Design a protein around this ligand. Structure first.
Ligand SMILES: [Zn+2]
Lengths: 100, 42
């Protein structure tokens, strides 16, 4: 922020230390807010995990966490999520022109 | 789904590490096949 000076604290319970594993070898952090993105968050981590948000599937507690909601819905502050790679959804997404 | 209308029954998980369907060990959400928690409930 730099020179905000309007209640230096605000997050407190917010601001997650998003831990996220990829398969086994890795485990990387994606520190964000509690309720900040998840959507745009996934878009951001896409390259770091080599998994684009469109295929990318965040699983924690067997729950399918995605860009559809917020991070605090999954409450992943300080827990490693599990990333996975699925089979191509070409039958699910017809017409592979737009972002295909 | 067809079985259990709008009721998520945990007999259907999928661990992508095994690339085979599992019935996890919930307390941890581990896979029974490899005990890696890369399981999503289907
Ligand atoms: Zn497994």
């Amino acid at each position: 922020m730099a020179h905000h000076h309007h209640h230096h604290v605000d997050d407190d319970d917010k601001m997650l230390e998003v831990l996220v594993k990829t398969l086994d070898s890795q485990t990387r952090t994606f520190i964000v807010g509690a309720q900040m993105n998840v959507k745009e968050f996934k878009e951001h981590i896409a390259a770091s995990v080599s998994i684009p948000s469109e295929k990318q599937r965040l699983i924690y507690q067997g729950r399918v966490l995605q860009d559809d909601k917020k991070l605090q819905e999954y409450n992943v502050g300080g827990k490693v999520i599990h990333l996975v790679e699925r089979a191509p959804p070409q039958t699910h997404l017809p017409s592979g022109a737009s972002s295909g | 789904g067809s079985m259990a209308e709008a009721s998520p029954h945990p007999g259907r998980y999928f661990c992508h590490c095994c690339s085979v369907e599992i019935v996890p060990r919930l307390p941890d959400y581990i896979c029974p096949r490899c005990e890696s928690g890369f399981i999503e409930e289907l």
